[PDB]
Design a protein around this ligand. Structure first.
Ligand SMILES: O=C(O)CCC(=O)C(=O)O
Ligand SMILES: [Co+2]
Length: 200
């Protein structure tokens, strides 16, 4: 895909049913919620987290916290299925030592989008992003280090895993408004699992 980045198409297909069961379990403790940006806007993507650290919005900016600010309880632990799939994908992608401490779970309803951004809240740039697609298909934009650097547009379908790191660790990326559709395992949405090393 780029220097240090790869798409492992359908890599998570066999694991997907189990991953979705575990999403449901995570969400039972820390429900999906549409977070409000530091600038005051409700995101169209609904999110939750598992693992030690959860990505959250705050008045002062984006940040990681071990506490879910909605439930005021810790985030649920990382499911075994998540851990195992992430490790295998990272290894296949050339990042054998990846040990995530954070998984952001994104839910896209039809029309939901995540505009171009960098994943720039993690101090240790040696660790890649491992990004798992489940359910409805989406167009993923993958750019460069500047907002106006040319974008690649890639369809991501159920089971696809994108990994970026090294040279491409800070590349701009996003998801275009989700097209309407049906998927037998997620019904009416796309999920994304975004694994990160957010701490030291
Ligand atoms: O849904 C995706 O594939 C991308 C999500 C994303 O970029 C993020 O969680 O920062
Ligand atoms: Co991102």
């Amino acid at each position: 895909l780029a220097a240090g980045a790869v798409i492992l198409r359908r890599f998570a297909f066999n694991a997907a049913e189990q991953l979705i069961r575990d999403i449901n379990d995570v969400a039972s403790q820390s429900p999906f919620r549409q977070m409000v940006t530091p600038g005051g806007y409700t995101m169209s993507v609904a999110m939750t987290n598992c693992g030690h650290l959860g990505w959250t919005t705050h008045r002062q900016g984006y940040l990681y916290s071990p506490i879910d600010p909605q439930t005021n309880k810790p985030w649920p632990a990382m499911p075994q299925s998540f851990h195992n799939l992430c490790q295998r994908a990272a290894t296949a992608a050339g990042y054998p030592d990846f040990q995530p401490d954070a998984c952001l779970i994104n839910r896209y309803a039809p029309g939901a989008k995540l505009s171009l951004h960098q994943d720039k809240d993690e101090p240790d740039l040696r660790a890649p992003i491992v990004s798992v697609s489940l359910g409805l298909p989406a167009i993923f934009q993958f750019g460069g280090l500047k907002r106006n650097d040319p974008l690649k547009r890639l369809l991501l379908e159920h089971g696809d895993v994108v990994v970026w790191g090294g040279e491409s660790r800070l590349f701009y990326h996003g998801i275009q408004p989700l097209k309407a559709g049906f998927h037998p395992l997620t019904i009416d949405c796309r999920y994304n699992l975004a694994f990160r090393q957010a701490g030291k």
